[PDB]
Ligand binder design. Structure first.
Ligand code: TPP
Ligand code: TPP
Ligand code: TPP
Ligand code: MN
Ligand code: MN
Ligand code: MN
Lengths: 187, 541, 539, 540
């Protein structure tokens, strides 16, 4: 995050006509602090029907790659199983794994607002989002048990296709260039 | 009533979070969650402690927190509450103790037009607390009871995690406001689990260190335990946990030249320690937990949480350090024997020799905590507390009482006579917090607390320092010795606290006897000779 | 001399030039430079120093030294929680407009965040409570710059003094003066000629005239901090004990509900009375607020206007004055008859007896809770006596130390007049819980100044008396008498103390005794509700 | 709903208290008092101003405040509002400008568990504001409608008195919160404020002997002292003048005053700084408010008034007047000698064009100094500059807000509105260039002309130690900061009329009213600035 480094200074403020006190040998930092490894393993059973929502600052999780995942553009995607944002309100997951800090989607917010679906918050740092009143637990990574049910993957894959098709077909049929058209072109 | 439901949910989630004790002070208005807390104390689910003195009440909470490591709430509710709780909150911040300060704002009342009955604010909350969380006013709609129950418990778990350092490993005080309007519980998780579960966390920062280099360990407040450093000669502060069996007496340090230093925790004692930590010729490796690392001079080479070692210390270095340890112990012991007058160092030696595993030792600031280190107490098996965050002499009596009560409560849970808690404080420290002895018959009282007061009628530590030079003799007496002539016995009797003045060789046997109550032992001590005693010790090194 | 020593001696010299007569010093190593400079100034007779152990009660000692004679007072202490302990006195000083200078030693600011022993966020710790937070530059060993450094140090000290005494704002209050100090802590550029302050800032005249028509049926309510209004002297005045009285037409607080004033003039900051507080919360009654400084109370939502003085047209109806004068006699006669008919001695009995024992020239120090209100109910006539009470936040902390400091400063001013008389009396009236709570204020080192004529009257009903006049589980401690032995507390701090029954009080106060003494009077609170209910039924 | 009543009561009391203008910014939540403010805006009782950029909006509020001296509200609604209003609030504090920041907290939502998208607070509110007042939540009580009306109007009056300094004489920003859950009770008769505060005086007289050789330095916030009208006076542009005996800033180093009377807060000219710090010169500070200026601590006395005895020696006045004429002629002459147009040339042209009744808004850096060195006679003209912290931010919206407020004053007296002329530098113009973006629905000034003197960078660093030619190799990039913006293109983008003119065409162009709000750009050079000043003093 940001830090405030304030330096009081008084005249003379400009260099005198020209010996700088040295640092550590070999260009090393004066006090060397290696980057910490923050680790908090958390047991999750994947046979319960799960959706993954990935927000800003989300980590990368290989053991969750098979799960249907709604990932914000800034989220570093790690899965191979995308779920379109518009397909979420047509699904009823039994549990949610929330990665990082979700901010973008109203249905994501609505889903996370429901107090009846357990949410597991997996984050990179000590902070975790308060968007869900029913966060069961926090972690940095998942220690998984089981595998997602085949019927559950079919539904998500099926609604995902509908959302992609709906966006693609309706953009093609729209008479006027809109910002959504510009976004698809850039994408 | 929405407020009422909210209060029982919050109190229930706090209990689930491990809050055993809550400290309250009567005030102008009704305490945060007062009725919910009152129900829980009847059921024996939570234990309440009430005091009139708000300053001593915060330090009582600090003691209840450090006694067994549990987060403690203070619900205080007056126009002087914030000012009186400041010292305790500052200490909770620097010593990293989980202190949840409960307040109750009135959104229906004005603010800033004058004095506030509820919460007269200072400027320290914004800099001392891990978090400031405020519940919403309880809205009155029954469709959302499940939704509001989840929000309230989530927020309460967020308060507890911040206080205990569950995700940050940086415990400290947090401010928890439950707003209110003048004038069966939605259940939590099954099996009594916290609403938001915080599984164990590790902050890993390994540092490469070569132990073949002549290494000394200085371990201070908040130090961790490191099995790979157990063999190293270790100058351990009394509150520091021991990793090994190779101690090095503080007075032996200036008699040695360590090639490098591993520093554990936050050191606050001994000028030879600060000189060594500042020596630009000595690489210093700081191993602490939490965001910041101690380094007054800025000389430290690296900081982390753990050491990855190569090699072993040279056996010549070990025997050299062991031999200076022996001379240092010998010097203290002999010069104490050769000194006719009883000093606080004599008292500290006697208290140390009487300690046994399972005891809790509470050490006041100033000479007591240093004197115990000079007596070479073996802290293994002992729980040692001291308020080293700011090292104030305020609040120590209530800190000892609270720690005795928390430590006795954990023991009561085992099902097993309560373990001893023994406190050593100076006379100024006792005078500062003497009002902490005032416990109502309505209130929890320790069963096994013995407070030992070493009384040299003033601040003996200033005999030892700059102001103690005999050239300063005339002026220094008044502005540093600060003699007072307080009669400790009359003071204890006024508070109905068993007390006795005894000579130092009576201390061991008296401490062994069960006093079957909270009691105060006073030992008269001299400080006029303190400077020459220490000079005689150094000369015998 | 080394830099910290010079700087500490400069600050002390400028403080003395600025009118500081008394300094409260709390022991610590970091403030050694200020401690040494203060001691040398005390030995030369330039100031009177007061050493205390406990910084919190030391703060209230400074307040007492300030309110006793109206001078700015400095309390000095070391870094760490010793500064945090000044919190409560600072909050009182803020709300009572007391010129309390909190002079704290500190470590250099770049040492914050480094794990330095005994170091905290001191600058700004008090936030909104102080009139100013001013810090000196860490003194550096620049022997050429010493003249300019002397100007900056004395100037900052004059800023501190002006903010504390309200020299430009007319709103005196606490100031935080932080001095970061570096080693060595253990050992003088001159100020202005003729002992003048470096920057001379005369006390301001703050004036806000306000038109008020007195033929409207008018009652005055004067609270803490009220000024003197000669053009309001004839009016019926419900005056708090600490309010100085302009005239000779007192109106008992219990007489207020039996009257229908058409308008209310409010002087200063009223705190005390439920009939007062009810009446001021009446939207229908116009209230004009007159104060000596910029602040004015928010107790009434229909404060029509603000001012420092009144511009009066008209005169009150003679019938209005006659009637208010009757209701005043009626109210105080009810009190005195119900006290006589009451079988048991209560703190109200004790306050009536204390009020009778006073004489003009006395200083009276009242504790919070029932004492300050009992004195008002007993109908004390305060003219000619100086009445002090910590009305800022009306807490129980520091009352003993406030009575001691007030006696000392009141006596120092008297030595100053040159009178060879015995110093005038200071009589305090405090409850038993308040006394026990601040009993360590009795502690005074053998070297330290001791009041010559202070008698502390403890009205001891063995608990909290005002709670009869009405809850939380916090109230369970009051459900049981505390049984703290007041006499044993007094001997702990080697203070003369005696129990007496209430009739001995007059005669015992008339004999001087030890310079400081405690008279404990046993009282009953079990009958308090009965007594007070009998007073209202008699009106 | 009890809150709408509350909101309309607050707005009504605000209007009764002299608030004519309120600035709003759109955001995710409704602005505080929005319906009540739009009610009052439609009926003409108050004038709203909307902007997208929150930072330029706060400076617009400052201009609206200092243009005619009234309190103005800014009410904003986002997780960036507190951060973007920061600079304006710091300026309001240090320049003593009555700026009321309105917020609407929500007692029924959680605080501190994440990001609040109202009032994301920083740490400056504690240090900057005169007061921080929050009403309570409005509650259900027809029974208590009279008492709550009394409380709401009293608190609003408390907010206004704190912001205007009605009792403290220390005007400044105030934080006013009206909380939100989510037939108006009358005020006093004849539009009286609920709590009336009659005029207040703070009097601290200082004895001063004028026979001692005395100079007067007057800066920002200075009062008017008739008993000092004849003294030689070095008056900053924003300082109201007492008399007709000016002393040019550059004459000061050539004189040796025996004592200084300093009015208000000076910030210009190093010779002023050295004289103020000279240990042998007694300094008397006469100011209004709680604090006094004294960087060196050298001052001998502070108060509000002078009580004078004696008269200055004629030889002292004669020589002060002589050095004053020496300095004015040195600047005119070398300006005439200097070929390239510089910002100093532009300031002289603007000064000559000014006439009584004008409002002149000055930017920081060389513009406000150059006007002082051009020797403008400021009497009859109201000069505004953000001297509190002397930032180069917010000067466009400041000038826009000042002209709007000054023109509003001209309307309420029942001809064409007085001219408002702003002289700013090119960096200053670029900094706050988004102030030019004004929607069609928003009020726009009628007689605002903004003169931008463009030397393509900061000319002031050419006059300082880093302008020394030993730093020729390195000063251009880190201090000169050339940028090459096309001012004409920028003004065209926002549909603001702009023009390039030369200094000799400035007066004629300024005379004629012009189609409303306009920018005149004058090309200037800063490569010859150090020599030009070297030439001016070299003639002294
Ligand atoms: C609240 C507070 N005030 C002041 C100090 C400074 N101080 C440190 S040690 C000390 C003397 C303590 O005396 P005592 O408790 O009797 O111990 P002794 O020196 O006699 O062993 C003081 C005043 C402090 N640490 N905390
Ligand atoms: C409204 C309020 N209630 C309680 C307190 C704390 N408090 C003030 S006075 C008091 C008891 C006073 O007892 P005592 O000093 O014996 O005087 P008494 O009322 O018995 O005469 C307490 C607990 C407070 N600060 N404010
Ligand atoms: C917000 C802010 N940033 C930086 C500065 C420092 N500064 C002072 S003058 C100046 C140069 C201004 O240039 P310009 O507006 O073109 O005026 P000129 O000197 O060229 O006439 C700068 C960057 C400041 N005062 N405020
Ligand atoms: Mn001692
Ligand atoms: Mn009592
Ligand atoms: Mn420029």
């Amino acid at each position: 995050g940001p830090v405030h480094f304030d330096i009081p200074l008084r005249e003379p403020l400009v260099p005198d006509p020209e010996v700088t006190p040295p640092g550590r040998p070999a260009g090393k930092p004066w006090t060397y602090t290696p980057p910490v490894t923050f680790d908090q393993p958390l047991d999750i059973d994947l046979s319960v029907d799960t959706v993954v929502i990935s927000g800003h600052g989300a980590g990368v999780h290989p053991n969750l790659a098979a799960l249907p995942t709604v990932a914000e553009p800034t989220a570093p995607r790690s899965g191979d199983n995308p779920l379109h944002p518009l397909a979420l309100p047509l699904l009823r997951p039994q549990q949610v794994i929330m990665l990082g800090r979700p901010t973008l989607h109203r249905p994501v917010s609505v889903l996370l607002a429901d107090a009846e679906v357990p949410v597991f918050a997996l984050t990179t740092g000590p902070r975790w989002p308060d968007v869900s009143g029913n966060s069961q637990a926090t972690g940095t990574r998942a220690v998984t048990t089981g595998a997602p049910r085949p019927a559950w993957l079919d539904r998500c894959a099926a609604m995902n296709r509908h959302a992609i098709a709906a966006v693609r077909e309706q953009l093609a049929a729209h008479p006027l260039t809109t910002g959504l058209h510009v976004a698809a072109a850039v994408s | 009533n929405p407020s009422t439901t909210q209060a029982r949910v919050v109190v229930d989630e706090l209990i689930r979070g491990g809050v055993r004790d809550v400290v309250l002070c009567p005030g102008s208005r009704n305490a945060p969650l007062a009725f919910a807390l009152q129900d829980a104390d009847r059921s024996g689910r939570i234990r309440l402690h009430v005091r009139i003195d708000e300053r001593t009440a915060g330090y009582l909470a600090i003691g209840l927190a450090i006694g067994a490591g549990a987060p403690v709430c203070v619900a205080m509710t007056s126009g002087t509450a914030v000012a009186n709780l400041g010292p305790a909150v500052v200490e909770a911040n620097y010593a990293r103790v989980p202190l949840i300060v409960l307040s109750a704002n009135r959104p229906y009342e004005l603010l800033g037009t004058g004095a506030n009955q509820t919460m007269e604010q200072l400027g320290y909350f914004g800099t001392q607390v891990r978090a400031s969380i405020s519940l919403g006013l309880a809205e009155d709609a029954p469709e959302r009871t499940s939704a509001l129950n989840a929000t309230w418990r989530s927020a309460t778990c967020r308060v507890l995690a911040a206080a205990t350092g569950a995700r940050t490993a940086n415990a400290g005080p947090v401010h928890f406001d439950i707003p209110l309007r003048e004038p069966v519980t939605p259940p939590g998780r099954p099996a009594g689990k916290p609403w938001t579960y915080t599984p164990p966390v590790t902050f890993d920062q390994p540092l490469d260190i070569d132990l073949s280099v002549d290494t000394v360990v200085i371990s201070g407040h908040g130090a961790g335990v490191h099995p790979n450093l157990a063999a190293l000669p270790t100058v351990a502060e009394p509150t520091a946990p021991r990793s090994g069996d190779n101690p090095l007496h503080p007075l032996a340090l200036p008699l040695l030249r360590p090639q490098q230093v591993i520093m554990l925790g936050r050191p606050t004692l001994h000028r030879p320690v600060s000189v060594l930590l500042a020596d630009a010729e000595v690489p210093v490796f700081a191993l602490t937990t939490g965001p910041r690392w101690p380094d007054v001079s800025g000389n430290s080479q690296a900081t982390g949480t753990r050491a990855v070692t190569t090699g072993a210390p040279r056996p010549a270095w070990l025997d050299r350090c062991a031999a200076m340890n022996r001379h240092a112990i010998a010097a203290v012991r002999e010069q104490l024997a050769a000194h006719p007058l009883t000093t606080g160092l004599h008292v500290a030696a006697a208290v140390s020799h009487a300690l046994r595993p399972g005891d809790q030792l509470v050490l006041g600031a100033s000479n007591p905590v240093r004197d115990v280190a000079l007596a070479g107490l073996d802290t293994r098996g002992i729980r040692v507390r001291s308020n080293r965050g700011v090292a104030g002499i305020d609040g120590t009596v209530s800190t000892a009482i609270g720690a005795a009560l928390a430590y006795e409560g954990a023991h009561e849970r085992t099902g097993s006579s309560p373990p001893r808690t023994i406190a050593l404080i100076g006379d100024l420290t006792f005078v500062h917090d003497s009002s902490g002895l005032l416990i109502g018959p309505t209130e929890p009282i320790p069963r096994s607390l013995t407070i030992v007061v070493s009384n040299d009628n003033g601040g003996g530590i200033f005999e030892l320092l700059e102001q103690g030079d005999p050239r300063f003799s005339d002026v220094s007496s008044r502005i540093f010795g600060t003699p007072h002539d307080v009669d400790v016995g009359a003071l204890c009797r006024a508070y109905h606290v068993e007390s006795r003045q005894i000579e130092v060789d009576e201390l061991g046997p008296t401490l062994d006897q069960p006093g079957a109550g909270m009691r105060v032992l006073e030992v008269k001590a001299d400080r006029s000779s303190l400077r020459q005693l220490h000079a005689a010790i150094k000369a015998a090194l």
